[PDB]
Amino acid sequence: PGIVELPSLEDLKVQEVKVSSSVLKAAAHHYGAQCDKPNKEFMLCRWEEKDPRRCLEEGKLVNQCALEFFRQIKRHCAEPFTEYWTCIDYSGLQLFRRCRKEQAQFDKCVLDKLGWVRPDLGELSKVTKVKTDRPLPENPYHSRARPEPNPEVEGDLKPARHGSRLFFWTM
Amino acid sequence: MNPIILIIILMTVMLGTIIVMISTHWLLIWIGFEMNMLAIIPIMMKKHNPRATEASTKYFLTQSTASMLLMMAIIINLMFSGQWTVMKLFNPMASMLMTMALAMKLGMAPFHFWVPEVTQGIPLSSGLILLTWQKLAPMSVLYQILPSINLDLILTLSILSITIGGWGGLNQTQLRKIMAYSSIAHMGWMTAVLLYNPTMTLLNLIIYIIMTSTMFTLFMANSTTTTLSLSHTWNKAPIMTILVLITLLSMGGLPPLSGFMPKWMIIQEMTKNDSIILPTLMAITALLNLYFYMRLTYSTALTMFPSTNNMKMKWQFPTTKRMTLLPTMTVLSTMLLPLTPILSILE
Amino acid sequence: MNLMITLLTNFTLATLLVTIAFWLPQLNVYSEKTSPDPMGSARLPFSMKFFLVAITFLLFDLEIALLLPLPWASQTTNLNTMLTMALLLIFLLAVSLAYEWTQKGLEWTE
């Protein structure tokens, strides 16, 4: 069949978010609140294109703005973030309920120094809208033309012509 | 034999068969088959005698082996298709395994070896149920899988079943074994025509169901199980002798009776597809069927066998049995020939 | 693989215990037992109630396996259909128990 097209490594070389699980888990709410629009753009592109090779650059945009999150964490309130992620990281299950005091301290420090609001329950679970400049793909599945349907029946139901015609029957 | 329990069991059998009929998933087909055999097991243990236990053991073993083959076909079809619609299969092994699984279920030779034994060991109502209602569901299963049916296998099974049923019924003197071999021959006759026009298969199934029901109803009404008591019945009611004579005349496909309706029209769909030797061979085996039918009517009504002395007391008591649907099914099995094109309702 | 490691270690410790209990006292030279129960010569009677209660256990365990997935199912969206199905299934268990009560099942082994 056809040759599968693959981008080379030159389109795949970026800086990496070399962070642990609890580091991402501690600031995940402010992650979803601050860098929301590039994430929505990238996953709308992913869900409508259904092809990684047509969304890669968009993901790069996310991989820029996410770093712009962490720098804003690092230069201003790095110590409360350190306390929060180490308290989260001690738990094997990574439960959010066992580090409420450090969560409140980090929230207060962020709200006074930079002012990011922790989202309420159900805010991140709702569906949003994206303004995107890419065109809508008319053929996402790469499908050919469907076969022509067979013609239907038309006309009035005429009576039987000369009966059943079963070797002697006229009725 | 609690009447509530018997009613519930009969409703379970009906529900299982209709679940096989009306479902669109293979699992529900197997569900109906399993519930049907599970609820038909107590029907063959009605009289509580060891012969019934023997017959039910053989029946359960054969039906369970067929059901395991049926899952083998279903799982192979799932592997090669990934979907569960009851339609043409997507693998030749699936079609082959399904074909002999349904042949085992329906008593088609050479998988017929349970049919003349089990029907010998069960009461006549259970024999009527097994030879009439059990054949309905796998006919529906075979009808819904006809695009993927291999022609050679079903033709070999059909001709082997017809020949073996005729030659096995040529020797037995018990009524139930003769009925079993006649059912085998009719099964082969109406499975030979399936791939060309299944309307003929449905018509032959309905005709065979009606005619076998008439035969079994007459056998329960006369309380006769062998050839000799069926000969002795002429002292009790000669009209019943006339009725069994005319419906056994109809049973061999002699015109102008109803039994000539399916098979002749089956031949009407053999020469359309350019096949000539096959209807001749099955007609010769139908002549064998008519030979032992003629032997039965010679023993029954066309002669006058010597009776015993106690018939006189039996002349002082009318038949008190619930002779249900005997006249309607007797008329529908003899004088239905001028209404042949009624098969059009089966399309 | 750690689970199978634990299983193999446990099975080998059981093998070591039975080897100590079976072959270690064979060093002793005590005696040979020639040895020349209420069961004299009769065949084992087929007490049908035990087989009946065994297959009753089998049927009840089968539909217990049917009844099982409620803790996982409790998060489903259609709660009314789940509630109807679970109540009707436990009612079916009650009906089968009532039938097994009525038709002389729970007598002579109550």
């Binding site: 001690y90 738990s91 094997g92 439960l95 066992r98 | - | 750690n2 689970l3 490691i5 634990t6 299983l7 270690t9 446990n10 099975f11 410790l13 059981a14 093998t15 215990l17 039975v18 100590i20 209990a21 079976f22 270690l24 006292p25 002793n28 005590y30 005696s31 037992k33 040895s35 129960d37 209420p38 069961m39 084992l44 007490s47 035990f50 209660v53 065994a54 256990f57 009840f60 365990d61 217990i64 009844l67 099982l68 409620l70 803790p71 996982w72 409790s74 998060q75 709660l79 509630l83 679970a86 109540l87 436990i90 268990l93 009650a94 128990l97 009560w101 729970l106 002579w108 082994t109 109550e110």
Partner: protein
């Protein structure tokens, strides 16, 4: 470092069942105005060592084994099913953490009757076979009622994982809103271990009469391991103690305390009631335990939907 954990789980099990025998001996002595073993050492500390070394040098009974392989396989399977089954207990973290640990223990407890069946089959005496069949029937029925009770308990919990059950029992104990299920589970833990007042394995012939003293000791250690297992299971699942994620040994001490008093309650109950009959406890389940258990299951599966208290899956 995993095999060290396996060894430190499996060797204290054997020590704990030997000290089950010793503690049960002096408790049954002191319950009945007499005294237990105190001659061998200080307060009878060295008695289980004497028991083990005595039972590991004696002669066998030499039975006419119909199947030698089955006779060998029965005590190995019994000890395996008693010893490898202790894994998923969360004290405070299990050795192996399963999402379906309770189902795992339930399945192997349901299949534990194979040792009894093979012990009955290995002995050529038919009365031993009859006793084995009676014990198997009692055990499978009582496993049915255990299955229903446990099904109700984890549908109250909502998740099959045993480690989340500690989190479930944090505010209040499960015994407070499931006290009737608690009483049926207490009769079931009294009864499933082949114990008095329902001990039909001693009154009239055991299921291992022709078995040797070594296999008999193995069977007894296996039964006592199952006893401690299900006692600790009742302690964990009906009397869940407070567990700090940073300070775990308070939870370990607390559930050890509840396990010890529940084992003392076991030895208490076994020394206060006369034995039942076979038809008596068959009547106890099949006409008195099963409908109440079914009604409790119906009520506890209808309650969280009407109370808006459906527990989380995760």
């Amino acid at each position: 470092m995993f095999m060290i954990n396996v060894l430190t789980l499996i060797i204290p099990i054997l020590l704990a069942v030997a000290f089950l025998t010793l503690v049960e001996r002096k408790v049954l002595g002191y319950m009945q105005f007499r005294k237990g073993p105190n001659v061998v050492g200080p307060y009878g500390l060295l008695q289980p060592i004497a028991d083990a070394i005595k039972l590991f040098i004696k002669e066998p009974l030499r039975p006419a084994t119909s199947s030698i392989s089955m006779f060998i396989l029965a005590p190995i399977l019994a000890l395996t099913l008693a010893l490898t089954m202790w894994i998923p207990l969360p004290m405070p973290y299990p050795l192996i953490n399963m999402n379906l640990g309770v189902l795992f223990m339930l399945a192997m407890s349901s299949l534990a009757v194979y040792s009894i069946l093979w012990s009955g089959w290995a002995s050529n005496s038919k009365y031993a076979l009859i006793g084995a069949l009676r014990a198997v029937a009692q055990t499978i029925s009582y496993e049915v009622t255990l299955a229903i009770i446990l099904l109700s308990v984890l549908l109250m919990n909502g998740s099959f994982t045993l480690s989340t059950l500690i989190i479930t029992q944090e505010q209040v104990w499960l015994i407070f809103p499931a006290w009737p299920l608690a009483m049926m589970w207490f009769i079931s833990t009294l009864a499933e271990t082949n114990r008095a007042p329902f001990d039909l394995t001693e009154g009239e012939s055991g299921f291992n009469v022709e078995y040797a003293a070594g296999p008999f000791a193995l069977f007894f250690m296996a039964e006592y391991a199952n006893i401690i297992m299900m006692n600790i299971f009742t302690t964990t699942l009906f009397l869940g103690a407070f567990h700090n994620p940073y300070m775990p040994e308070l939870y370990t001490i607390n559930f050890t305390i509840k396990s010890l008093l529940l084992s003392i309650t076991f030895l208490w109950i076994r020394a206060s009631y006369p034995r039942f009959r076979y038809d008596q406890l068959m009547h106890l389940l099949w006409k008195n335990f099963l409908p109440l258990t079914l009604a409790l299951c119906m009520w506890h599966v209808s309650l969280p939907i009407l109370l808006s208290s459906i527990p989380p899956q995760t």
